[PDB]
Design a protein around this ligand. Structure first.
Ligand SMILES: Nc1ccn([C@H]2C[C@H](O)[C@@H](COP(=O)(O)NP(=O)(O)OP(=O)(O)O)O2)c(=O)n1
Ligand SMILES: [Mg+2]
Ligand SMILES: [Mg+2]
Length: 427
DNA sequence: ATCTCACACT
DNA sequence: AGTGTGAG
């Protein structure tokens, strides 16, 4: 049977990313409790990134800054730039590009968010395993690596635990066997140290990293020892790792599916899924899910690292909650034109940098009284990077959503506007 | 109401 | 084509 040990995969995720970006530009904020907010004049603004000094006081994402200062009175704040009446994340997108290009020097990268990327190191490990003869792997090659599940068997501080575990790992390493999966992950972890040293040297940003045999495990491993540390999760660490791992913490199980696994099967931890046959899991959750759950609770997962460093979509949105929803026709025209103008400058930059053009425009709205994130999506042809054409066209395809008999009145008031360029192709 | 992106289902 | 889910 195939033990899900064919690959070496890392996930690298920046530490409190938006905060690091502001702290590098504004040294006043380094090594202090700070957070990043947007739109300051409602409850100090909503918090979108929290530094680790501020997390020690309880400050979280999604809190209002005014409530955040209640937990942490010395908290310093940085506010997202605002342009055309809405958030502008250019600074963070450009800092993201810095990190992704560096990681792209080492292996194939799958950009998975603005601050993290999966790395398929299988080939780079095979290559490294031949350039280093058969010589041992010194602990000095892994100065920030944790071996999950170690130390074991017959120090009271965290670095002491780290070293002892690493020591036990390396001492037990079969450097004889170029094919041993634990050796492979170790070499992968040496490379990830270098990758993270380069990221920090060249950008000033610290980050953490998971190393394992698949994307789900590498991501789990990444969070085990955040910040500024990397974690190797061997296939053999999985049974004890999963035996008390809440199901909701595994990637793609944090929502409705993970809740129904918990409710239907009557279990709390990943490891309890092993009691069920694959056909049982498939009866409850479908053939693809039951099969994915059957393999995943044994540490096995085959989703590949997609070679993709570039977004497939480029989107633009503003929500208009509560009293602020839009009820004029020309109010809806104006905000569409604001969204299309940011879209145009981002699309122009993308065409110049990446040699591709978006060919479809996706317009989406919500209306007060609805429930879900979106209430209505419609598409149209994107033939010119012209903000006025994009907004006019986007209006045309939604203007019948206006149930109002009136001319200039628009309602159910629009709680949300979303424009998204997509279906790119080479140019 | 703290703006984004990917993907499966149909 | 359009909806729903999951995520950072
Ligand atoms: N819901 C979210 C999640 C993240 N983000 C932005 C700001 C985050 O700093 C950046 C990366 O998100 P994140 O990786 O989930 N956690 P972030 O790096 O702050 O902190 P760590 O927990 O990763 O150290 O995405 C956001 O704007 N809205
Ligand atoms: Mg992060
Ligand atoms: Mg992240």
């Amino acid at each position: 049977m195939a033990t899900g040990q064919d690959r070496v995969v890392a996930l690298v995720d920046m530490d409190c990313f938006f905060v690091q970006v502001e702290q590098r530009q504004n040294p006043h904020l380094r090594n202090k409790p700070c957070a990043v907010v947007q739109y300051k004049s409602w409850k100090g603004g909503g918090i979108i990134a929290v530094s680790y000094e501020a997390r020690a006081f309880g400050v979280t994402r999604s809190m209002w800054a005014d409530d955040a200062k209640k937990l942490c009175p010395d908290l310093l704040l940085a506010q997202v730039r605002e342009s055309r009446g809405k958030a502008n994340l250019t600074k963070y997108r450009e800092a993201s590009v810095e990190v992704m290009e560096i990681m792209s020097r080492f292996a194939v990268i799958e950009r998975a968010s603005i601050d993290e990327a999966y790395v398929d190191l299988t080939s780079a490990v095979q290559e490294r395993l031949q350039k280093l003869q058969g010589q041992p792997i010194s602990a000095d090659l892994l100065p920030s690596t944790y071996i999950e599940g170690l130390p074991q068997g017959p120090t009271v501080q965290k670095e002491g635990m780290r070293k002892q575990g690493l020591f036990q790992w390396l001492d037990s390493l079969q450097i004889d066997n170029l094919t041993s999966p634990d050796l492979q992950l170790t070499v992968g972890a040496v490379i990830v140290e270098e990758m993270r040293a380069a990221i920090e040297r060249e950008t000033g940003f610290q980050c953490s990293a998971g190393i394992s045999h698949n994307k789900v495990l590498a991501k789990l491993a990444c969070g085990l020892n955040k910040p500024n540390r990397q974690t190797l999760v061997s296939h053999g660490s999985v049974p004890q790792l999963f035996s008390q791992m809440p199901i909701r913490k595994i990637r793609s199980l944090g929502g409705k599916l993970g809740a129904s696994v918990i409710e239907i099967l009557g279990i709390e931890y990943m490891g309890e899924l092993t009691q069920f046959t694959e056909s049982q899991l498939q009866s409850h959750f479908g053939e693809k899910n039951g099969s994915w759950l059957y393999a995943m609770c044994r540490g096995i997962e085959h989703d590949p690292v997609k070679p993709r460093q570039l977004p497939k979509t480029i989107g633009c949105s503003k929500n208009f909650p509560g009293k602020t929803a839009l009820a004029t026709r020309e109010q809806v025209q104006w905000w569409l034109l604001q969204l299309a103008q940011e879209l145009e400058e981002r699309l122009t930059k993308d065409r110049n940098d990446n040699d591709r053009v978006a060919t479809q425009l996706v317009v989406s709205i919500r209306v007060q009284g609805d429930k879900r994130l979106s209430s209505l999506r419609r598409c149209c042809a994107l033939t010119r990077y012209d903000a006025h054409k994009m907004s006019h066209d986007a209006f045309t395809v939604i203007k019948n959503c206006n149930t109002s008999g009136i001319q200039t009145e628009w309602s159910p008031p629009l709680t949300m506007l979303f424009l998204c360029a997509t279906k790119f192709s080479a140019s």
